[PDB]
Amino acid sequence: CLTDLVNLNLSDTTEKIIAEYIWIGGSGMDLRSKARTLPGPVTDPSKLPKWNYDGSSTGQAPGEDSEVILYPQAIFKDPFRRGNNILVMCDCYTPAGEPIPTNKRYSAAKIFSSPEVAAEEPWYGIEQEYTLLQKDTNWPLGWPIGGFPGPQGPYYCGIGAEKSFGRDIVDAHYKACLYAGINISGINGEVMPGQWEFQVGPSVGISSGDQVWVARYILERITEIAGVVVTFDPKPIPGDWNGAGAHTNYSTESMRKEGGYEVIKAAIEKLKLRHKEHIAAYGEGNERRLTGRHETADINTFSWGVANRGASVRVGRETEQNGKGYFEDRRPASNMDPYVVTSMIAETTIVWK
Amino acid sequence: CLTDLVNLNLSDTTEKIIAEYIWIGGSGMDLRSKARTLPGPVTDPSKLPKWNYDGSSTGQAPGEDSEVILYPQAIFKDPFRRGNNILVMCDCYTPAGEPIPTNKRYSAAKIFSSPEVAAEEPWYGIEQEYTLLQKDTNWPLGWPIGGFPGPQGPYYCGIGAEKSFGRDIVDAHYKACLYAGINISGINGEVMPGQWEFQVGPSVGISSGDQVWVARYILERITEIAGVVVTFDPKPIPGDWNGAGAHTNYSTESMRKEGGYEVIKAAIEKLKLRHKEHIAAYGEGNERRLTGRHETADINTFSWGVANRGASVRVGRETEQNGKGYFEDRRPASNMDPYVVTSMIAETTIVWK
Amino acid sequence: CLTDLVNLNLSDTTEKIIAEYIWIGGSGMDLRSKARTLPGPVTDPSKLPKWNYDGSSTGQAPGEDSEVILYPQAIFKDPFRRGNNILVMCDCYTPAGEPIPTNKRYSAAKIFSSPEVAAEEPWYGIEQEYTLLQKDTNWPLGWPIGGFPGPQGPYYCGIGAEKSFGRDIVDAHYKACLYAGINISGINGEVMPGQWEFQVGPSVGISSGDQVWVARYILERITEIAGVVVTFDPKPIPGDWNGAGAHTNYSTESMRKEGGYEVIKAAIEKLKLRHKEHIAAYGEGNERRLTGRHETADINTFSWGVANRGASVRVGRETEQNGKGYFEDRRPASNMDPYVVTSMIAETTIVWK
Amino acid sequence: CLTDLVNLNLSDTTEKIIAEYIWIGGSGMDLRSKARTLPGPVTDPSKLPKWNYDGSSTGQAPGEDSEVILYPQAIFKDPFRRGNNILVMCDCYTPAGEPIPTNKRYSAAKIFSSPEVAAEEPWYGIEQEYTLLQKDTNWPLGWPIGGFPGPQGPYYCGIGAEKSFGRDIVDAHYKACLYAGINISGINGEVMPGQWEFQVGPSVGISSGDQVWVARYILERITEIAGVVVTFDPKPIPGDWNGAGAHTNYSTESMRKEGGYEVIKAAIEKLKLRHKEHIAAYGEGNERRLTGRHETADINTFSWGVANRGASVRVGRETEQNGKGYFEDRRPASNMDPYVVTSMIAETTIVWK
Amino acid sequence: CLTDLVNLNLSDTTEKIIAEYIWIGGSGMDLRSKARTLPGPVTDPSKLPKWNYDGSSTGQAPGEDSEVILYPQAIFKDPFRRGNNILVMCDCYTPAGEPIPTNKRYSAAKIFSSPEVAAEEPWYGIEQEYTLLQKDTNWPLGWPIGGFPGPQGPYYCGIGAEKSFGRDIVDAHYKACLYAGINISGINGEVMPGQWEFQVGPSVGISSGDQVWVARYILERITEIAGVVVTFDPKPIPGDWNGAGAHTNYSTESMRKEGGYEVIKAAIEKLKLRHKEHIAAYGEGNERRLTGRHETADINTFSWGVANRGASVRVGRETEQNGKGYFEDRRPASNMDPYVVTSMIAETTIVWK
Numbered sequence A, B, C, D, E: 001c002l003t004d005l006v007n008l009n010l011s012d013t014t015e016k017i018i019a020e021y022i023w024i025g026g027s028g029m030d031l032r033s034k035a036r037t038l039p040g041p042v043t044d045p046s047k048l049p050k051w052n053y054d055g056s057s058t059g060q061a062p063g064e065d066s067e068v069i070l071y072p073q074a075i076f077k078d079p080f081r082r083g084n085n086i087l088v089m090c091d092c093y094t095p096a097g098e099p100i101p102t103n104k105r106y107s108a109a110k111i112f113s114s115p116e117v118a119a120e121e122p123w124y125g126i127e128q129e130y131t132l133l134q135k136d137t138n139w140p141l142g143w144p145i146g147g148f149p150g151p152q153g154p155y156y157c158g159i160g161a162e163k164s165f166g167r168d169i170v171d172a173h174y175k176a177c178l179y180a181g182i183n184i185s186g187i188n189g190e191v192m193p194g195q196w197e198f199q200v201g202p203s204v205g206i207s208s209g210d211q212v213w214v215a216r217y218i219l220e221r222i223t224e225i226a227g228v229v230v231t232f233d234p235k236p237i238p239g240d241w242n243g244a245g246a247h248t249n250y251s252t253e254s255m256r257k258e259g260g261y262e263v264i265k266a267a268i269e270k271l272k273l274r275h276k277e278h279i280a281a282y283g284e285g286n287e288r289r290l291t292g293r294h295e296t297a298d299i300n301t302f303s304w305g306v307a308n309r310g311a312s313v314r315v316g317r318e319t320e321q322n323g324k325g326y327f328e329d330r331r332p333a334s335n336m337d338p339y340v341v342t343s344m345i346a347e348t349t350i351v352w353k
């Protein structure tokens, strides 16, 4: 019957391809997509046609001048439609060729193009945390309605029906992402029951932001299948339960070479000065998360330590002892725009003095 | 839809591998795991990177010094993720290289390294019993809520919908373990309805403890899928129902060779003297199990017989008549740490006088 | 998820094998099994190890002398575990090598070994009837609770959702048995709604008993999957509903050769004389079945006819007209031990005068 | 239909009466009752017939000598049967006239008979706490199954559907008790959601124990109607939730007269010396309750303060400022026998030196 | 059965009375009560005993100094317990006789005692709006879960099953209050489906605050019976749905006499100057309600008109045309403390210049 049709192999019948054009919508936090048929397979982003959508239905243009243009930027294999079908990550422009206010990729692209950044060859691994919720009631997966599970403790990395809610979704997403070609580096159960993580493994410049959005798209499409809701809300349940962040790990050419640990301290130092204006772009709602409790640092203070999860920045035991590595900015909230955060770290770290 | 993604074959798309790093957490009875992407297949434990986790969320380190280090010790095939993906059993260390208080494998490794033990080449077959429970109500599987099934009798090794609860889970685990490469030697329905057994077949020294933990990991992960809870609690329901033990069967080089039956009696003799201090490590809650009824021996007396299930140690009809074999220490409870019990039998049996 | 693991092909991964050792327990009507791993495939019964079980949990030995020994007698392919895995039918012995009181195969083995029996080469086809029940309520499958279906008539060999309850189970069992290598000759819907039949086709001497037990094992294991209960109770519902019997068909070398119909009458004649002592072994509860109504003969009278289903023995139209064939002893109840009935017919028929 | 019969007025039809004889059973914590028809109304306990019950079904006598005798001690009006029908509180004796081991009223009666006690005229007000549970799952009323409500805080004396579970029962019991003639002094919602209190107001000597038992009888009979379970277990849920005590408030003639506050301290002083042996009779399971947290004092220390709920004994602000009053022994657990606790306080306080 | 006991008439049996002492707790927004038995009826507040509660469980005192004292201030008939039983509204004091920080009645009592205020004889009518919610899901009554009803419009003062949710509760509360003796002036369905109103009719000085609290207590106790939740939250659902306010109508001796309309303008004028510091006490969350839309005035502007529901203060058509009357301060939110608002209007209106 129904999954027989969803999983039809089109390769046996024509050469035609399905391309799913993904973009970011008016809120800057809402993913949108639609699909077109293309005459044959494509591997190069710049050999795909540009397209348009109804900007008036995503809060990005008026009705009388409704067209917004889609620039194909990255191609990944579609894990849902399979065969030769593709997901295409997109950029948003007016018909005049201006990037619209909600296109944060443009500005970020410029920074990673800029030659003294590109030469430093920045690397990001970003750890996406998220919470799963029951549809309609909007209460965390596996929690009883109008009630709570046992207190935090057994949940982090746990196993068992009483401890681990929705591995299904998680394990599915992991494979999906790998197949798609997203550089996904790992997953893990998080502290708060119903909370989970994936990390998009060391990825260079713009492609980090690109991957992280497409990873999010795949996540939510998977939840959709499961009849479950995701939030990227930084602190979804108030009280004695963990919030969710998008820890960004970072390194430059000079940082992973000999005596990079001095360049690390130097970088952290710059970050301290601009804490104020980084917090401002590190995602909204963050005040509710960064409280100094629950493995976060207070929004108002800046700090850094070695194995310290109470800090604003953390530098692994391993990269300290090796005099070379990366550091982890724990400040960005789960609803961070990776384009914004990713480039603004490279900016406050290389260009500015 | 959803199982189509969980069961994707990655072999068709990249060389990459998923490694699921397993460890033991702060309670010493709670398994934890998380997963990372590795660039290609691996068969040798010492060719896998060491890793870390958040010790502060497993009750094994403070927040300000949170890192705990993972030493890959054994590799098995992942029966869930399949293809070339692996489970990796692990060991727990401070960044300074000290084994943390809860790492009972280190001490046990030392004893099986020690040359007069290694030479005796000890063999353990351990019989894990466990009980299956309904999620939330926490009442045994196939029992009616706030009520009991018929009295014990038809359940041991039984068959039929009224006698045999959750064979699904059991049969699955058997194959999983075998596929994984765990030396699993057999299974059986236990005396108490909803109680089951598997034996991790004759395995040498450290690898016994390693296999038994990974087998337990796989059991619980399977129950997770079924939406059922496991306990290793030695006596889960009070009254006229069997408890659960982790009988350890044991033999040395000299015990399975000609006239080993004398070395057996000699061993049992030593064991009687140290009963007090063995009971102390044979798992907590045991007082509720070892009552002398229900095929156990009273906690306070030590005994041993031939075909005697009422005894503290038992020696099979078969190994008596053959003047060579193994004996069965029935004392350890189902929530025994096999590292502790497995090495402490070799210790009280070979080294001490 | 779960059936992916139950159905794993182990052939791709090791040579190892799962052997499911089946025996008969304390009541003489309760099947029991457990499984062990064996190092490679096996086709010869006498190349399988002997094993033991806990006789104290099946009511076959005391706790202090608990071991009972298992002698591998027949091998069949496991239809559940598939691949190279096997079911092993067993025999029950004390550690001294005595057959325990409940081992009726030993005695029957002796009779079919005895040379003037073996030479007559006896043949049994036995027709197992059985009734399917809802779990917990214990009321016949497809019957409304605390109520009855339409009166008997449309059910025998019927088809359709209102007439035919649990064909699923039946059809499954048929293939299962065939695959296993049981000589199964046919199946049919019985007269009472929810009642069914299979026949273990012409099988020689001991192997008849052996097959019929293993057929029953496979039946119940299948109902277990379906969450349904079986009874072999000869009259499960009182009143105007059919009971269940285990009709034994029988023939010797001389009976199927020319003018065997005289040897048949001669046999029937002997059977009439020992009706009293045959009824005594033809299974308990039989008084409730054999009432002279519902295609049975009264327990107290012995009779025989040609196409007569009201008779104690029946001789087909076909084997009458051919002067050679078999006859059908309709007296054994569905909970008959085939070892006892099968050998005792050969005994009262050949040896005794 | 059914409540029309339960509530029939018998006064319109005969003079006859129903007496419900209540006693305490073998565990010393289980109430039992049965009813007899008496020819007319009765107000004097000593004009009621003595009766017997089956001591062998309450664990209080062997089968061959099964009779145990019931002595009517107190009469109350039956709030369930209403009209002229009565509850009768009872005392338990052998046919020889010996009080059986589980009759703690006999001993307590002697102490309140004793003239130097009777003259001091002791007064007890006892505050019974208890917890209401869902039938079968045995989880607290208003809690979600396998989960918890919001943390403690809004529940104590609260109102509202989300805060206040089973007022129905509580309010019913209150009126019931008053109607019955139990001197009930007040009720209140307790700290732990689903936990409640009533106080049996200042009552003299023996009649305190008598009223508290009949009060408990009425409580449970009311829950029975509601299909809800009661526990008097001192700490029914482990962790961060209140236990349940039976605070006993106490005063003597001299304590409520001028400068009784000196006699109070003097009494407290004596109580400190016998803390050890009082804890031994203050009900079993108490170790789990008295932890020093949750408004209790640690089992091992004795303390006392003025407005201090963390203490072993507490003396109200009001009775300090007035130089005369009562004090509150907070040590007895909810499953205290009031006969034992009530007399033993008068004993350690008046007779002993 | 159960409502037979809840509704027992105690008047037939003793003279005793149940008094339900009501107070306000630690949040200043949470009502608490408990009940005591009193020896006979009472009509005069100052003939009731003072009482205490556990301040440590309402967040009003530490554990070691836990006692807080209850001053009976007003008596009403208990509509739940009926007969001669009473609700007692209370005041909160330390044992030293200080009013605790959360006792806003003390300060308000002083202001209405003050002779130039008492002489002006102030009158309040306060209109309590509130929203009804489903237990556990916490979604408005009669709304579908994770969805909305038809847009606002048919709901205000409506009738019918699709328009009018929980009239049951409202109508019941109306009678309850009247019976109790609360001067309740009227009720009405509010604009937002599931939202309701009652007005506590012209009441003088302190007794306004007293009645409004007791009214709220009765409301929530009724919802408790219905298994429904109340919120006094000023804007319980975001978006295009009405918030809830506690409009205070107000008049002085001089304002309802000839040419009071000048004293009204004069009063309004004073209120405009102190708008800033009135908003500060008019209840928390108010920023979310007072938006200028949905019949409110913006928090930051002060305004007033005649028939104007968009204004901060409104003066009826009727009292304008009569040159004498009252005005309506629409600024206070539904979670207003009437003690605070009620006195502070009298203060900013009479005493201050």
Ligand SMILES: Nc1ncnc2c1ncn2C1O[C@H](COP(=O)(O)OP(=O)(O)NP(=O)(O)O)[C@@H](O)[C@H]1O
Binding pocket: A123, A124, A125, A126, A127, A185, A186, A197, A199, A200, A201, A202, A247, A249, A250, A251, A256, A325, A326, A328, B054
């Ligand atoms: N040289 C590098 N520069 C920047 N990021 C890197 C580098 N090497 C690795 N990363 C990674 O960025 C990541 C950080 O991984 P993670 O496994 O989440 O540890 P974590 O900081 O302990 N997280 P958490 O428990 O969520 O607080 C992964 O994608 C790593 O692959």
Ligand SMILES: Nc1ncnc2c1ncn2C1O[C@H](COP(=O)(O)OP(=O)(O)NP(=O)(O)O)[C@@H](O)[C@H]1O
Binding pocket: B123, B124, B125, B126, B127, B185, B197, B199, B200, B201, B202, B247, B249, B250, B251, B256, B325, B326, B327, B328, C054
């Ligand atoms: N030489 C040996 N030394 C130690 N253990 C062995 C040896 N040979 C076999 N074992 C085994 O250890 C096991 C014991 O199996 P098992 O039959 O379940 O014990 P049991 O006494 O029968 N059980 P129970 O029903 O739990 O009381 C399996 O792994 C056997 O393979």
Ligand SMILES: Nc1ncnc2c1ncn2C1O[C@H](COP(=O)(O)OP(=O)(O)NP(=O)(O)O)[C@@H](O)[C@H]1O
Binding pocket: C123, C124, C125, C126, C127, C185, C188, C197, C199, C200, C201, C202, C247, C249, C250, C251, C256, C325, C326, C328
């Ligand atoms: N020579 C033979 N000796 C013994 N049994 C035989 C012989 N030939 C055939 N059988 C059979 O034994 C069987 C008897 O089958 P069956 O047809 O079910 O009995 P029935 O009288 O026909 N029917 P019922 O009304 O269902 O009780 C099958 O295995 C037949 O193949």
Ligand SMILES: Nc1ncnc2c1ncn2C1O[C@H](COP(=O)(O)OP(=O)(O)NP(=O)(O)O)[C@@H](O)[C@H]1O
Binding pocket: D123, D124, D125, D126, D127, D185, D186, D197, D199, D200, D201, D202, D247, D249, D250, D251, D256, D325, D326, D327, D328, E053, E054
């Ligand atoms: N002279 C007295 N001697 C003994 N008990 C008395 C005396 N006078 C009153 N009591 C009382 O004993 C009681 C104690 O009631 P209670 O209201 O619960 O005080 P509490 O210590 O505040 N309780 P809690 O919240 O459980 O800690 C009632 O029956 C009081 O009437």
Ligand SMILES: Nc1ncnc2c1ncn2C1O[C@H](COP(=O)(O)OP(=O)(O)NP(=O)(O)O)[C@@H](O)[C@H]1O
Binding pocket: E123, E124, E125, E126, E127, E185, E186, E197, E199, E200, E201, E202, E247, E249, E250, E251, E256, E325, E326, E328
């Ligand atoms: N002199 C007065 N001083 C104060 N309040 C008064 C006075 N006279 C009457 N009230 C009243 O205070 C009230 C205000 O009630 P209400 O009739 O609902 O006003 P409303 O402005 O129509 N309501 P709304 O739809 O909520 O905006 C009632 O109790 C009136 O009887």
Ligand SMILES: C[S@](=N)(=O)CC[C@H](N)C(=O)O
Binding pocket: A129, A190, A191, A242, A243, A244, A245, A246, A289, A294, A295, A296, A309, B054, B057
């Ligand atoms: C557990 S952790 N990921 O190491 C700490 C992160 C945490 N979930 C947070 O962002 O608040």
Ligand SMILES: C[S@](=N)(=O)CC[C@H](N)C(=O)O
Binding pocket: B129, B190, B191, B242, B243, B244, B245, B246, B289, B294, B295, B296, B309, C054, C057
């Ligand atoms: C039946 S048995 N496995 O021989 C005895 C083991 C039993 N379940 C126990 O109490 O340990």
Ligand SMILES: C[S@](=N)(=O)CC[C@H](N)C(=O)O
Binding pocket: C129, C190, C191, C242, C243, C244, C245, C289, C294, C295, C296, C309, C330
């Ligand atoms: C229909 S039939 N198989 O010929 C008769 C068998 C019947 N159920 C019996 O109990 O003998």
Ligand SMILES: C[S@](=N)(=O)CC[C@H](N)C(=O)O
Binding pocket: D129, D190, D191, D242, D243, D244, D245, D289, D294, D295, D296, D309, D330, E054, E057
């Ligand atoms: C409010 S209270 N009765 O003072 C608290 C007492 C608590 N339930 C106890 O464990 O004794």
Ligand SMILES: C[S@](=N)(=O)CC[C@H](N)C(=O)O
Binding pocket: E129, E190, E191, E242, E243, E244, E245, E246, E289, E294, E295, E296, E309, E330
């Ligand atoms: C009908 S009405 N009271 O004028 C509307 C008032 C509205 N519920 C408010 O936000 O105050």
Ligand SMILES: [Mn+2]
Binding pocket: A127, A197, A199
């Ligand atoms: Mn991480």
Ligand SMILES: [Mn+2]
Binding pocket: A127, A129, A190, A197
């Ligand atoms: Mn994390």
Ligand SMILES: [Mn+2]
Binding pocket: A127, A247, A328, A330
């Ligand atoms: Mn991190």
Ligand SMILES: [Mn+2]
Binding pocket: B127, B188, B197
């Ligand atoms: Mn075993």
Ligand SMILES: [Mn+2]
Binding pocket: B127, B129, B190, B197
């Ligand atoms: Mn076992």
Ligand SMILES: [Mn+2]
Binding pocket: B127, B247, B328
């Ligand atoms: Mn064993």
